[PDB]
Amino acid sequence: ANKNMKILIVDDFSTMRRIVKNLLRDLGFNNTQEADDGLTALPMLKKGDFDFVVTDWNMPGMQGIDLLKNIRADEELKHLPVLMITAEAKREQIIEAAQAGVNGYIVKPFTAATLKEKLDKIFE
Ligand SMILES: [Mg+2]
């Protein structure tokens, strides 16, 4: 239930990456790294032996859902737990992400407490 887990944080707005990185810092996970887009995240996952991915859903290059799909179709990557960050869980979006295989979702603006709750849910 490891706090050394290697985490990738994906999102185009560096200030949001930095909030996420902190939040996870309050919770005991310090092993976090960043990518600014699914285009930049895929090569980091592919070569860097990650355990966990927190991805925004809206990115101009390759969208959250395209990253998730790329991860799930890669035998190497296929086991990764993925939390998606959304500005609003319209159900059509959550449904579609669940189909695509996400482990959970969390609505922004979120908190540490909600982050943990979400972390617990996914990992069972
Ligand atoms: Mg975004």
Author numbering: 5 to 128
Paper passage:
The Ca2+ (or Mg2+) of VcCheY3 is heptacoordinated where four coordinations occur with protein atoms and three with water molecules. Although D12 of StCheY is not coordinated to Mg2+, D15 of VcCheY3 that corresponds to D12 of StCheY, coordinates with the metal ion. D60 is the site of phosphorylation in VcCheY3 as it corresponds to D57 of StCheY. From the crystal structures of Ca2+ and Mg2+ bound VcCheY3 we proposed the presence of a conformational barrier composed of the hydrophobic packing of W61, M88 and V106 and a unique hydrogen bond between T90 and Q97 in VcCheY3.
Vibrio cholerae contains multiple copies of chemotaxis response regulator (VcCheY1–VcCheY4) whose functions are elusive yet. Autophosphorylated CheA then donates phosphate to the response regulator CheY. Phosphorylated CheY interacts with the flagellar motor protein FliM and influence the direction of flagellar rotation from counter clock wise (CCW) to clock wise (CW). As expected, both VcCheY3 and VcCheY4 possess (β/α)5 fold typical of the response regulators.
